Amino acid sequence: QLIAGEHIPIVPVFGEWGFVEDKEVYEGVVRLTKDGQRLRNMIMSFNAD
Amino acid sequence: ENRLESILSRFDADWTASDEARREAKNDLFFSRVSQWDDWLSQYTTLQYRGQFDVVRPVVRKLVSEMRQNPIDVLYRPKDGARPDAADVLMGMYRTDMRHNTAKIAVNIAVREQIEAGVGAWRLVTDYEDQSPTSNNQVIRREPIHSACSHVIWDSNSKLMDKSDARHCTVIHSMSQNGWEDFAEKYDLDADDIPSFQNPNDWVFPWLTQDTIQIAEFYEVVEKKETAFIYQDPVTGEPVSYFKRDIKDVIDDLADSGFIKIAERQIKRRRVYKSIITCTAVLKDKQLIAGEHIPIVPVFGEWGFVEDKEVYEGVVRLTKDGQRLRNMIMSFNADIVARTPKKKPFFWPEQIAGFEHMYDGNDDYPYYLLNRTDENSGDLPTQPLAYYENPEVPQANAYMLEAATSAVKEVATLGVETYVFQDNLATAMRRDGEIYQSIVNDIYDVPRNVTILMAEVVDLATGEKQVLNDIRGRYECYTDVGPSFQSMKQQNRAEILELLGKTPQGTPEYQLLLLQYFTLLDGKGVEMMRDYANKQLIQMG
Amino acid sequence: TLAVDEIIETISAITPMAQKAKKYTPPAASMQRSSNTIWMPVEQESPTQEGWDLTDKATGLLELNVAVNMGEPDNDFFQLRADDLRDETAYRRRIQSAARKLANNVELKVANMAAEMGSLVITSPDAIGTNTADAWNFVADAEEIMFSRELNRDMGTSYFFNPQDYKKAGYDLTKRDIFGRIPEEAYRDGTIQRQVAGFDDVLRSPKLPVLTKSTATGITVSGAQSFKPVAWQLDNDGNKVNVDNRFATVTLSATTGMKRGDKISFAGVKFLGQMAKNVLAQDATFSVVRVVDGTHVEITPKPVALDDVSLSPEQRAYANVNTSLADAMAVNILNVKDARTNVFWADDAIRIVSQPIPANHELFAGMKTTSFSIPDVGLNGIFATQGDISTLSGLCRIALWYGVNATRPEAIGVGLPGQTA
Amino acid sequence: TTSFSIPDVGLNGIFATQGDISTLSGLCRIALWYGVNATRPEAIGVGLPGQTA
Amino acid sequence: SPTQEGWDLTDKATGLLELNVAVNMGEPDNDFFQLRADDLRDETAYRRRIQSAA
């Protein structure tokens, strides 16, 4: 079914975007903080115990 | 004697020469993009905790934003002794075909790779556009080269930052199956024969590998003296000269249209040839492409030669060690926190025999009770109660974590500011402007501005194809670096505003204000204002 | 003590036959169901009759075919112990050496297949250095037999020497006591010429096989046999199964001493000019393909006799031998002494069928697979890594699937110098 | 493993997949983990026709 | 690298093996020369001895 226009009508929006080894990578602001957040949650749970 | 063998010999020599720098740059890219635990061995082994507490990424983000907030683009300025407005047409063409998203995205990619690994690059290509062409039914566009450190290989005998003296360069294209099919359709190749070339990643990080198809493009620059024809223009003039290679299917058409051959000179110039190759055979042999320079523009960070060996560096290579040590220390300390027996008392079983339910943790009792006597020992031996010691993070761990964090913070300081990186980017933009000017001279219809209006002299062959006619008086403007503007109207507006910012409030201030009103966009109110400004300027003469 | 990253290069191999062999990649989806075999037609030959009245003499149509298939993958399975210093020091170069070895194996299979299926045999009772210009004589004999048999050579020809015979040819050229251009080329460089006696490519191949002598003797045909060119035949259920045209099983007195690759020629059978059906002066030479049973052999050029009465005219139009076996003719073995082989062919006679190993599919999750590009030879395989936690190790495997086929065994040839005693 | 929606019935399951490098083969497993419970047997009924002696 | 043919290669994986060679330096090639103070009033013999040594 032919649709109007000359392009795919989907517009993407990216954060930190790049290629590593022919492989696309994107990142926001949450990926790096996850390890520290998970450690802090674990430590607080242990201390509550 | 074999062309394929010669090309492969050059490529192998260049690959082996650049092996070290490519490996270090790829390591830096993987460290700063995928993960900071780059071993690939301790994944099949026993599993332990490995945390990633990043301290280098904020520096890279700040540097990327800082160097990006000041865009840089080519600016053509007339030479000495040339006409004052000799760069207007070329500048308009550049802003026309470099305003698209592809150019900005390629520049941003190159800048980010220059910050992280130390080297980036982009490419300039020419295509046939039939809808909105820049000139001569053709457009010039800029495309990115991802992982340039491993994908673009320059001539090993090059001692310039912009690689302007490099005689050849090989670019390794990696594409999916559909990408290869599209490439074969585009370049009239056979889609059944999958191309075969060296893997750019060179079999590192096998845990990070993708099913890709590799082909190579070999650009070579040949400088030679070639015959140029001197004609006499029907509309005045005399030094109108053309190259015999370009005027080869319209030689009789020139005479028929009114050009009489005066003389003939041998003039030295460069030709760029492209070859599409695999590791076994050449697909396209020496397809001549437009331009005097290899269409790949490289950007470097901290670049130099150590012992005839090219070394480029960014901002992550030095901080890698401290960051790794900090990660290891934090992982060790998390293991100390997690897997360690807690602080509980040491009891003999007969000390609490019968009173065990008092020590489970409930609060139902006002105190605790202990057994006193044994039927054989008379009384339970007296000894102070011991408690398992609380977990402690060692002073060595704490001190070395502090030292590693301080070392990374100290060594991850680009410059004092990114002035050197921006200067290298400006150098790359100067090379890009040179390449673009040559390509424009080779494919576009550049009018000649006479002081007697712009004159465009072209003729059509018998096969209906049109051949451009560009005189040898072509290099009338040189390349500088200025702010990035999307159009000539915006550039004029910026220049007028800059002049108005320093002009004292006299008659030139009024003149510049009226000019700024003249050069405005159109709605309704700004249309009325521009009409008023035009009338005022015309009346003032 | 550790090393200093300065590899000492010791091996430099070349793959001329492999790089000059044509490579074919049929559709994988169809090949999987067709069981890794595809049939290709052969050039059609028509009969011809003379006369005015030709009632009930109208012939039919007969088109023959051959089949090309594949063998088994050539792998480089190797393990990687985690707790060893070499784990990252050597695995990359192991990958590179695997690529080189795979290319070499492809070349070896090509050379062996050509030398064992080469029907045309040129034998010399003395070495290449005996007389003067006898190397050119050896090449010109192959050119003349391929010209007299009316074999198609549009794509091109090739003649691969073994290094000893190539050196003998160069020595014969240089001992001419004269120096024009060819002798000076052969003196400075070892080459004789790129083109000799009509061949458009005369190379030296370092890994041509040595055809060991056959001890077979006193072998005679057991019973008159006639071979008919057909394209299909009925099976037990009544299905029409195709027939490969490049094979004929003959019954002999005893196949003692025979082996795959032996060159034979029966007594009285002479070649034919294929198109013109004119009797040549050279004995029909065949190459045994496989020794099945104990009294049967399988020779690749099917001996379709011209004087066979039991042949339909269309079948007789495909004749390549002037007579048929007669239960008494003796078979002479042409290779009577050990000698490295020089192999000549037409460039379209040998092909390399290839198929991909689709290990990139989602079915292979947990194993990382990429495409591997073999140098020199134009082939692609897969490179797969998986991790085993029972042994705390990482398995690596470079797989590559292909098969070497000889579509026209009558076009391939073998040269045997010193075939005395 | 990935999710695998079963049509008709409104259920999901696990589509798991593994590969082998020794033998170049692989395995798939469509697992559907569910349990039927009759929480009101006094509300469930059964109709038996033709239950003559 | 060794290679094996076939589809099923379970319990047939090989290890990695590397060889290496040693390069070193032998004894020096000296040249002694003793002279008194009075023999350095011409310097031609000394300079020619240096050249011959090289």
From Swiss-Prot, chain B:
Q: Which interval of the chain is the signal sequence?
A: none
Any one cellular-component term (Gene Ontology): viral portal complex
Note the coiled coil stretches, chain numbering. none
Asked if the keyword Transmembrane helix belongs to this entry, the reply reads no
Instruction: Give the keywords, sorted.
Output: Capsid protein, Late protein, Viral capsid assembly, Viral genome ejection through host cell envelope, Viral genome packaging, Viral penetration into host cytoplasm, Viral release from host cell, Viral short tail ejection system, Virion, Virus entry into host cell
A single Gene Ontology biological process assigned to it is: symbiont genome ejection through host cell envelope, short tail mechanism
Oligomer and partners? Homododecamer. Interacts with the terminase large subunit; this interaction allows the packaging of viral DNA. Interacts (via C-terminus) with the head-to-tail adapter protein gp4; this interaction participates in the head completion. Interacts with the scaffolding protein; this interaction initiates procapsid assembly, thereby ensuring incorporation of only one portal ring per capsid. Interacts with the capsid protein.
Record family assignment: Belongs to the p22likevirus portal protein family.
Q: What is this protein called?
A: Portal protein
Protein source organism? Salmonella phage P22 (Bacteriophage P22)
Source gene?
1
Q: Which residues of the full protein are shown?
A: 5 to 580 of 725
Swiss-Prot record, chain C:
Nucleotide-binding found in the keyword field: no
Q: Which domain of life is it from?
A: Viruses
Q: What is the effect of changing D5A?
A: Impaired phage growth; inability of the mutant capsid protein to interact properly with scaffolding protein
Q: Name one Pfam family in it.
A: P22_CoatProtein
Q: Where is this site: Involved in capsid stabilization and maturation?
A: W52
Tell me what the record says results from W52 to N/V. Drastically decreases capsid stability
The GO cellular component terms are: T=7 icosahedral viral capsid; viral capsid; viral procapsid
- Chain intervals for the UniProt region annotation (Binding to the capsid assembly scaffolding protein): 1-47
Name its cellular compartments.
Answer: Virion
Name its GO BP terms in alphabetical order: viral procapsid maturation
As for what it does, the entry says: Self-assembles to form an icosahedral capsid with a T=7 symmetry.
Recorded family membership: Belongs to the P22 phage major capsid protein family.
Q: How does it assemble?
A: Interacts (via N-terminus) with the capsid assembly scaffolding protein (via C-terminus); capsid proteins and scaffolding proteins form building blocks that assemble to form the procapsid. Interacts with the portal protein.
**Official protein name in the record:** Major capsid protein
Q: Which organism is it from?
A: Salmonella phage P22 (Bacteriophage P22)
UniProtKB/Swiss-Prot annotation, chain D:
Q: Which organism is it from?
A: Salmonella phage P22 (Bacteriophage P22)
Localisation: Virion
The protein here is known as Major capsid protein
What superkingdom does the record give? Answer: Viruses
Function description: Self-assembles to form an icosahedral capsid with a T=7 symmetry.
Assembly with partners or alone: Interacts (via N-terminus) with the capsid assembly scaffolding protein (via C-terminus); capsid proteins and scaffolding proteins form building blocks that assemble to form the procapsid. Interacts with the portal protein.
**Entry comment, domain topic:** The insertion domain (I domain) plays an important role in the folding of the capsid protein by acting as an intramolecular chaperone.
Question: What is this organism's lineage?
Answer: Viruses, Duplodnaviria, Heunggongvirae, Uroviricota, Caudoviricetes
Give the family from UniProt: Belongs to the P22 phage major capsid protein family.
